[PDB]
Design a protein around this ligand. Structure first.
Ligand SMILES: [Cl-]
Ligand SMILES: [Cl-]
Ligand SMILES: [Cl-]
Ligand SMILES: [Cl-]
Ligand SMILES: [Cl-]
Ligand SMILES: [Cl-]
Ligand SMILES: [Cl-]
Ligand SMILES: [Cl-]
Ligand SMILES: [Cl-]
Ligand SMILES: [Cl-]
Ligand SMILES: [Cl-]
Ligand SMILES: [Cl-]
Ligand SMILES: [Cl-]
Ligand SMILES: [Cl-]
Ligand SMILES: [Cl-]
Ligand SMILES: [Cl-]
Ligand SMILES: [Cl-]
Ligand SMILES: [Cl-]
Ligand SMILES: [K+]
Ligand SMILES: [K+]
Ligand SMILES: [K+]
Ligand SMILES: [K+]
Ligand SMILES: [K+]
Ligand SMILES: [K+]
Ligand SMILES: [K+]
Ligand SMILES: [K+]
Ligand SMILES: [K+]
Ligand SMILES: [K+]
Ligand SMILES: [K+]
Ligand SMILES: [K+]
Ligand SMILES: [K+]
Ligand SMILES: [K+]
Ligand SMILES: [K+]
Ligand SMILES: [K+]
Ligand SMILES: [K+]
Ligand SMILES: [K+]
Lengths: 74, 74, 74, 74, 74, 74, 74, 74, 74
């Protein structure tokens, strides 16, 4: 047999942005009171009380190309 | 047999933006009171009490191409 | 046999935007009181009490192309 | 004689309020013209002409208990 | 004689408030003209002309107990 | 004689407030014209013309207990 | 001959104003589409297409006196 | 001959203003599309397409006197 | 002959202003598209496309007196 795997990719993933910015975070915490007695946990606990967790992600591009190729015999 | 896998991709994924910005987050926490007694958890707990969790994602592009190619024999 | 897989993709996915922005988030928490006694949980718990969870996603483009190609023999 | 003054006070005077606020005072003065000639005052004068006197009293509670106890011999 | 003054006070005067605020005063003065000629005052004068006198009293509680106790012989 | 003055006070005067604030004063003066001729005052004068007198009192509690006790013989 | 040009001008042109203001211009453009083909103009053209042309003239006085005096011999 | 040109001007052009201001211009453009083909102009063109031309003239007085005097022989 | 040109000017052009100000310009551009082909101009062109031309003139007085005097023989 003759098997030819010859895909052609000339594709563009592209951005232009002029000005990127002017982002202001001023979150304000509240008043939090937690009273706990006789609590049983048998498994994992993720707990957050009054926290101000922030992610700022501001890439000038942030473009992505995911591409996958296989030729496969089982 | 003769088997030919020859797909052609000339595709564009493209953006232009002039000005990207002027984003203001000013969330204010409230008043939170939690009283807990004799609670049993047999399995995983995710808990958040009065927290101000933020994600800001501002890519100048943020374009994506996902593409997948297979030739396969079982 | 002769089998030929020759699709051609000339496709455009495109945006133009002049100004993107002027976004203001000012949520205010209320008054929350929770009293809990003698609760049993046999399975996973997700709880949020008075939290101000925010996601701000503002891509200048945010366009996507998903494509899949297979030639397959079983 | 035996005289016993033994009153018992277990009284509650109580408030709960969630949010107290959003008060806007925007009074605008008019046009006032006063012309006075040959006036005699023999006694105290309180005069106000075109004034914008304000009291804003906004207690979160503002509850009161007044109590009086006497045992008295003349 | 035996005279016993033994009053018992276990009284509560109490408040809870969540959020207290958002008070705006924007009073605007008018046009005031006063012309006075040959006025005689024999006694005290309080005068206010076009003034914007303000009191803002915003106690988070502002609760009060006034109590008076006497045992008296004349 | 036997005279016993033994009053018992276990009384509470109490407040809780979460957030206290966000108070804005922007009073604006008007136009005031005062013309005075041949005025006689024989006694005290309090005068205010076009003034913007302000008191801001914002105690987090502002609770008060006034209590008075006497045992008296004349 | 004796010729005398002796006019006397004692004239007042006067204004009093207390507060002049509180002017808000918020015009919004609509949608305008103009398609033009094979037009000949032999003479001057003044054209405006979707413009938001504004004059704000707010003199505190803005009073005027125009006067003319001539004595003339031909 | 005797010719006397002796006009007397004692005239007042006068203003009083207390407060002059509080002027807000917030005009917004719309959507303008102009398509032009084969247009001939033999003479001057003034054109404005989607412009937000503004004049703000706010003189505290802005009063004027124009006066003209001639004695003339031809 | 005797010719006398003796005009008398004791005239006032006058202003008083207390407060002059609080002027805000926030004009916003819209969306302008212009497409032109085969246009002929034989004379001057003044063109403005999508511009935000501003004049702010705020003189504290801005009063003017124009006065002209002639004695003339031809
Ligand atoms: Cl909170
Ligand atoms: Cl916990
Ligand atoms: Cl908090
Ligand atoms: Cl809350
Ligand atoms: Cl919990
Ligand atoms: Cl829970
Ligand atoms: Cl009076
Ligand atoms: Cl008034
Ligand atoms: Cl006033
Ligand atoms: Cl008076
Ligand atoms: Cl004033
Ligand atoms: Cl006075
Ligand atoms: Cl035209
Ligand atoms: Cl328009
Ligand atoms: Cl426009
Ligand atoms: Cl044109
Ligand atoms: Cl042009
Ligand atoms: Cl524009
Ligand atoms: K909080
Ligand atoms: K907990
Ligand atoms: K905990
Ligand atoms: K909250
Ligand atoms: K809980
Ligand atoms: K809440
Ligand atoms: K007033
Ligand atoms: K008076
Ligand atoms: K005033
Ligand atoms: K007075
Ligand atoms: K005075
Ligand atoms: K004033
Ligand atoms: K427009
Ligand atoms: K045109
Ligand atoms: K425009
Ligand atoms: K044009
Ligand atoms: K042009
Ligand atoms: K523009």
């Amino acid at each position: 047999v003759q098997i030819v795997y010859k895909p052609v990719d000339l594709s563009k993933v592209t951005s232009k942005c002029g000005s990127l910015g002017n982002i202001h975070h001023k979150p304000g915490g509240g008043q939090v009171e937690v009273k706990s007695e006789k609590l049983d946990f048998k498994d994992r606990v993720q707990s957050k009380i009054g926290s101000l967790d922030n992610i700022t992600h501001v890439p000038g591009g942030g473009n992505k190309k995911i591409e996958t190729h296989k030729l496969t015999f089982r």
